[PDB]
């Protein structure tokens, strides 16, 4: 019978040489995931889609921030094959007051704080 | 270094040409409202949208990917 | 059956029943029939709080 | 001269159909895409016990919000205002 | 008072500006066209 | 025999001047009209989504021809305009084909010495000068 | 449906815009009723937006 997986704590412990294919410190971890949908919740069971509406990824390629905490995780843990999950990178730090109309998420994942629309 | 020399003797000349003048009947590829346009002078293009403008109004289209 | 500035009416019944309920009660003011509605019983209370103003 | 009996995808003999190379490399392509998804998932920032009451202050008040709507689900007034500006359908110049 | 203002100041009530008190007359339902049509409920 | 209709004429109007340039008796008979109508309607849309891609299969073959009079491929004439960051579309792509031959030439020569220095930069696989028309323009 | 309903190219009228833009609306007759409660804003029209016009 077809039921719910059940995802082995050994696939999610991460190895030195997926370090450096991946590079990430394991130590100071990363604070915020970057989720995005790449796959349709058709053909899928009712609680993927579920918790791909619960997630907020109802629109595919549309990204969406998310905090790396365990339940956060867990959840992306079941859904984890309709979606692609990134590192939130801050190159100048969290925005502000001041600088909070004048950001733009790249395709790297870095949330700039401040975007120009200028040559460099 | 002589790749560079050798452009900047054409992209000279050629600036030499536009001042003289010897040109005529320009045409752009001009980027506006999602499409892109191969324009010259006293030409027609319909615009699939209001443009929130009076009747008989210059403006001035200014994302110009090619001008030739 | 109340005649005039209904809206006063208004503002008087929500500003009395307000500290009762800890929120801004819910109510609909009809003009045409000269009526206000509040969600909830509050019968004896609005009676008593009309007595005291006079009505 | 060669028929699949029956329906061609259905039932005991089946059209046979073989992987191709670009269907290969799609496979490929969003296994690679999910490893690194496993990879961003097994590094975690925080545990349960740092995690376990972070927003629960958020979540109260969201649902108090929601409440709030559903009780103030209402009716909406009526004006004299209205019912005389449909009396206007009559007016004349002269 | 300030509705009978508005009485004077607007036209002239006849049996041609009359209307119901909206929410009195739920309109009938019948089986025609598309949706109300065909197997009629 | 009180509320008869009165403007069936008209509503038959509405379907037959819509059903006129029809052939046979669909062009008159009302029945036989309204069941061709309904689907040249629907016809109608659907042909407005083929119909932008059928313009795009048209252009794309243009450009392929006249990129093959050049000499270069049309997967190569796209992928090295992208990089070269000239972000033109297949339809003025087309049309610089059929009307500005000499534009056209410029634009496969520049595509095929993209090209060419892909192609120094990939045997060479070290630290070389990245070449004058592979430099990457930034924008912050 | 295209087919079916006549077709045309872009044009303006006389070369419109090139020296000088000429507005190619020449009248407006507006035929009104005094009693008309189907004329009522059309009436409205006529008392305060037809001289701004
Ligand atoms: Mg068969
Ligand atoms: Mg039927």
Redesign the interface.
């Known amino acids: 019978k077809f039921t719910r997986s059940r995802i082995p704590e050994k696939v999610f412990q991460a190895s030195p040489e997926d370090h450096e294919k991946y590079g990430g410190d394991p130590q100071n971890p990363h604070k915020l995931h970057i989720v995005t949908r790449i796959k349709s919740t058709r053909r899928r069971p009712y609680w993927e889609k579920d918790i791909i509406k619960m997630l907020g990824l109802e629109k595919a390629h549309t990204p969406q921030v998310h905090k790396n905490i365990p339940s956060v995780n867990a959840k992306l843990k079941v859904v984890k094959h309709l979606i692609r999950i990134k590192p939130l990178k801050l190159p100048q730090g969290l925005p502000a007051e001041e600088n909070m109309s004048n950001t733009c998420l790249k395709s790297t994942g870095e949330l700039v704080v401040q975007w120009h629309l200028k040559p460099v | 270094v002589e790749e560079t020399r050798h452009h900047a003797e054409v992209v000279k000349k050629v600036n030499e040409m536009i001042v003289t003048g010897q040109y005529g009947r320009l045409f752009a590829v001009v980027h506006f409202a999602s499409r892109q346009w191969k324009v010259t002078s006293?030409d027609?293009i319909?615009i699939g949208n209001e443009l929130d403008l009076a009747?008989?109004e210059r403006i001035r289209l200014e994302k110009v990917l090619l001008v030739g | 059956k109340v005649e005039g500035d209904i809206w006063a009416l208004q503002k008087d019944v929500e500003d009395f029943l307000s500290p009762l309920l800890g929120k801004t009660p819910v109510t609909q003011v009809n003009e045409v029939t000269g009526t206000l509605r509040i969600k909830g019983y509050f019968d004896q209370e609005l009676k008593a709080w009309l007595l005291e103003k006079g009505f | 001269r060669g028929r699949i009996p029956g329906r061609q995808w259905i039932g005991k003999h089946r059209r046979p159909r073989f992987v191709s190379l670009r269907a290969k490399q799609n496979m490929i392509r969003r296994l690679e895409i999910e490893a690194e998804n496993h990879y961003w998932l097994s590094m975690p920032y925080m545990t349960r016990e740092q995690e376990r009451g972070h927003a629960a202050v958020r979540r109260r008040e969201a649902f108090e919000a929601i409440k709030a709507a559903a009780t103030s689900k209402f009716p909406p007034h009526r004006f004299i205002a209205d019912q005389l500006d449909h009396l206007?359908?009559?007016?004349?110049?002269? | 008072a300030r509705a009978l203002d508005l009485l004077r100041g607007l036209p002239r009530v006849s049996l041609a500006n009359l209307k119901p008190n909206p929410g009195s007359k739920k309109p009938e339902r019948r089986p025609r066209g598309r949706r109300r049509g065909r197997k009629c409920g | 025999l009180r509320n008869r209709v009165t403007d069936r004429y008209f509503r038959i109007q509405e379907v037959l001047k819509?059903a006129?340039?029809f052939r046979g008796r669909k062009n008159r008979c009302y029945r036989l009209a309204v069941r061709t109508v309904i689907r040249?309607?629907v016809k109608?849309t659907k042909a407005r989504y083929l119909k932008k891609k059928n313009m795009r299969t048209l252009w794309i073959n243009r450009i392929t021809a006249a990129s093959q009079e050049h000499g270069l491929k049309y997967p190569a004439l796209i992928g090295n305009l992208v990089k070269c960051q000239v972000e033109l579309n297949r339809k003025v792509l087309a049309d610089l084909a059929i009307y500005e031959p000499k534009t056209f030439k410029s634009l496969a020569a520049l595509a095929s010495r993209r090209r060419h220095e892909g192609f120094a930069a990939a045997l060479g696989d070290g630290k070389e000068p990245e070449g004058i028309f592979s430099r990457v323009v930034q924008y912050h | 449906?295209?087919?079916?309903t006549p077709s045309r190219f872009?044009?303006?009228v006389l070369?419109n815009?090139?020296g000088?833009?000429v507005?190619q609306l020449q009248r407006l007759s507006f035929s009104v009723s005094?009693?008309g409660?189907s004329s009522?804003g059309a009436?409205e029209f006529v008392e305060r937006e037809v001289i701004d016009f």
């Open positions: 006293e027609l319909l009747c008989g | 206007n359908v009559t007016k004349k110049w002269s | 819509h006129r340039h040249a309607f109608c | 449906t295209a087919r079916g872009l044009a303006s070369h815009g090139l000088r833009y507005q005094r009693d409660a009522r009436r």
